[PDB]
């Protein structure tokens, strides 16, 4: 039977399906070796750049212990804004403090999930997490999906929103302009359909336009057969 | 038979008629029996009845009513 | 019992002993658990009588009905001989004044008389074995008279999972009663059912004597 599929290639880390890492810009680090408690730490926005692979703008920050690292840029930032990191950071936009120290009902981004791992949550253009409720036990934060995850209160986060909103408000326009974007990122394209792909190429669909077996697939289905609507609970838009 | 208990009540006053048939006439009763005594009820009675007659009430707890009237 | 513990094993002889502070004479009891017995057939229950070698030590009341040469056999032994006619008297009159019910221990008959036993006595006596019954041996004049006078003991199995056959009442020596207990035991083990621990427990116990376990 047929060849490995379009997704199975991806997993190899072969180069058509390898992100560039040499035209791409820094990652967020908050650094916990100078700790949150017994803070020492303010910095100055050294410059602001666009990061290609995040599809969002990012800030270089010059810290006052002498380390240079990027922090994902908030809206309404100036070059020469001071950003502080600690709990004794002011409670204002672009300032970074623990969740407990942040009020309830304020918008927040760049939230830690393990204390001191530098931001692994809410680091996309224009989207933001809401602090709905806070208790000394656990602080519950409401995620971009509408969905509530419980985090440790001693996670760090930055007050405000991410910059680079309206991102999908503007369209991509044409196949050319789009081609241009995908080179900037990594996303296998032009991507055709399995339906007129031969029986070898793809599990569903033959020579001509019509599906083989149902599109909807198991949650225990094999690798290389898990294409379509993956483990769909519902489909359509009707009763 | 067993009694149940018969509650004897006599009719104090004949208020007016109920039923679209007309067939109940509604009458006010006073009780004279061992248990309660004195209780005033507005029961629905059928058939020729005069004032001061005796009725055996099967159920003490009742008193449906509807009311009006002469100009 | 203060007298003895009731889990300690003893000999057949040793277990029958005396210690009553009571008016009431020591009635002796054998109680046995059997493993692996069911009502999955009701029939496969142990039922028989066994003639004790030294009897209960209470007098049997035997009425024997017999006719022919078999009458002559009963008569010799010193039985009265009483007619079948008496069956019509038992059954017919439901009275309370001198009725003959709950006043005797067994009946023996020849086989032709058995139908008559069945209808007439069955209503009052039922199967409390005061009539002769086919499944235990108490039909036939010849052998059962001889054995019955010698004071046979009655046995039946309450299916689940126990059988009991108390030997008699104290009027006999402890060794005498020890022979009783052996003979009954050997019949019991003698009914052969599969599976390990077939005789789960055996006890020998009494009105207010030692209530004790014995090795069975």
């Amino acid at each position: 039977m047929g060849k490995s599929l379009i997704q199975q290639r991806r997993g190899k880390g072969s180069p058509t399906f390898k992100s560039p890492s040499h035209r791409f810009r820094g990652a967020v680090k908050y650094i916990p070796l100078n700790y949150t408690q017994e803070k020492t730490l303010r910095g100055v926005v050294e410059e602001i750049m666009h990061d290609p692979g995040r599809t969002a703008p990012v800030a270089r920050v010059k810290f006052e212990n002498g380390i240079e690292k990027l922090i994902i840029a908030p809206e309404g930032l100036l070059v020469g804004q001071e950003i502080y990191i600690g709990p004794d950071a002011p409670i204002a936009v672009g300032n970074t403090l623990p969740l407990a120290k942040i009020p309830e009902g304020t918008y927040v981004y760049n939230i830690e999930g393990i204390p001191g791992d530098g931001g692994k949550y809410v680091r996309a253009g224009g989207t933001y997490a809401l602090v709905v409720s806070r208790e000394p036990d656990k602080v519950i934060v409401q995620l971009p999906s509408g969905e509530l995850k419980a985090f440790n209160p001693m996670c760090r986060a930055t007050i405000g929103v991410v910059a680079g909103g309206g991102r999908l408000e503007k369209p991509l326009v044409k196949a050319g302009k789009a081609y241009y974007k995908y080179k900037a990122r990594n996303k296998f394209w032009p991507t055709p359909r399995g339906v007129k792909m031969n029986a070898v190429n793809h599990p569903f669909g033959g020579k001509e336009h019509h599906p083989g077996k149902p599109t909807t697939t198991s949650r225990r289905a094999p690798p290389g057969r898990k294409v379509g609507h993956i483990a769909a609970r519902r489909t359509g838009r009707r009763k | 038979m067993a009694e149940d208990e018969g509650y004897p009540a006599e009719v104090i006053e004949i208020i007016g008629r109920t039923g679209t048939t007309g067939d109940v006439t509604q009458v006010k009763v006073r009780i004279l029996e061992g248990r309660d005594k004195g209780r005033v009820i507005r029961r629905n009675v059928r058939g020729p009845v005069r004032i001061g007659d005796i009725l055996i009430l099967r159920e003490t707890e009742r008193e449906a009513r509807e009311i009006k009237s002469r100009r | 019992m203060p007298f003895d513990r009731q889990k300690i094993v003893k000999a057949v002889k040793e277990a029958k002993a005396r210690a009553k502070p009571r008016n009431f004479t020591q009635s002796v009891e054998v109680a046995v658990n059997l493993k692996d017995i069911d009502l999955k057939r009701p029939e496969n229950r142990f039922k028989l009588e066994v003639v004790l070698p030294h009897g209960r030590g209470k007098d049997v009341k035997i009425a024997v009905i017999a006719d022919g040469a078999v009458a002559e056999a009963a008569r010799k032994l010193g039985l009265d001989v009483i007619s079948s006619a008496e069956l019509e008297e038992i059954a017919s009159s439901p009275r309370q004044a001198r009725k003959l019910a709950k006043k005797y221990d067994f009946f023996i008959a020849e086989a032709p008389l058995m139908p008559k036993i069945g209808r007439y006595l069955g209503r009052y006596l039922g199967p409390r074995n005061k009539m002769p019954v086919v499944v235990p041996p108490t039909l036939t004049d010849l052998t059962p008279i001889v054995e019955k006078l010698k004071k046979t003991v009655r046995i039946q199995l309450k299916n689940n999972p126990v059988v009991h056959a108390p030997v008699g009442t104290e009027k006999m020596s402890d060794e005498e009663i020890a022979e009783n207990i052996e003979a009954v035991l050997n019949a019991i083990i003698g009914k052969l059912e599969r599976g390990e621990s077939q005789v789960k427990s055996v006890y020998v116990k009494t009105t207010m004597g030692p209530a004790v376990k014995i090795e069975g």
Binding site: - | T60, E61, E63, A64 | -
Partner: protein, 133 residues
């Protein structure tokens, strides 16, 4: 039991008076223990007979006997009915229950209006001409 100083018990009876069925439910004072729940349906064999005074009285009587067993002999009565999905006024079972209690021998405490009344507007079913007959 842990010593009781008063030697009287009180149970708060919630009575839901609908035009479709009548329910008579009694709970202790705290409310967190339901002793009895008997509804009109259980007396009868038919839906038409399901509400009505007679159904309401027996539904009350069956519950009453269980209140005696516990030792409840005082009752408050809280009359309610469906105020936010239907019109608030009580059905047959208001008038019927107070009589059931009296006859049964239970002592009657407060009789109350705890019926839901909104302080706000909401749309129910019915429009254009409102609900046509």
């Amino acid at each position: 039991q842990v010593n009781i100083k008063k030697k009287e018990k009180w149970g708060i009876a919630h009575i839901y008076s609908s035009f479709n069925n009548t329910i008579i439910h009694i709970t202790d004072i705290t409310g967190a223990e339901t002793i009895s729940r008997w509804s009109g349906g259980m007396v009868v064999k038919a839906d038409r007979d399901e509400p009505s005074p007679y159904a309401a009285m027996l539904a009350a009587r069956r519950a009453a006997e269980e209140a005696l067993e516990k030792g409840i002999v005082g009752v408050h009565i809280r009359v309610r009915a469906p105020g936010g999905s239907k019109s608030k006024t009580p059905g047959p079972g208001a008038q019927a229950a107070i009589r059931a209690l009296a006859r049964a021998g239970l002592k009657i405490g407060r009789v109350e209006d705890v019926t839901p009344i909104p302080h706000d507007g909401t749309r129910p079913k019915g429009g254009r001409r409102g609900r046509r007959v």
